Protein: immunoglobulin G binding protein A
Amino acid sequence: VDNKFNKEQQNAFYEILHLPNLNEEQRNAFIQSLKDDPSQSANLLAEAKKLNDAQAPK
Structure:
């Protein structure tokens, strides 16, 4: 997206939107973190995905 939203950040962004059973506050938090943080967020991406899994298939 912008001059920030590059490598891991965008892959993760996409994968994040791609979550089929995670959409609330977690989605929000992850968008926010994707927006402020460069590379730590990928670990956190794995977290968003596991959250998706936590509500639905863990």
User: Anything to note?
Assistant: The domain at 1-58 is CATH 1.20.5.420 (Single alpha-helices involved in coiled-coils or other helix-helix interfaces). The chain has three helices and no strands.
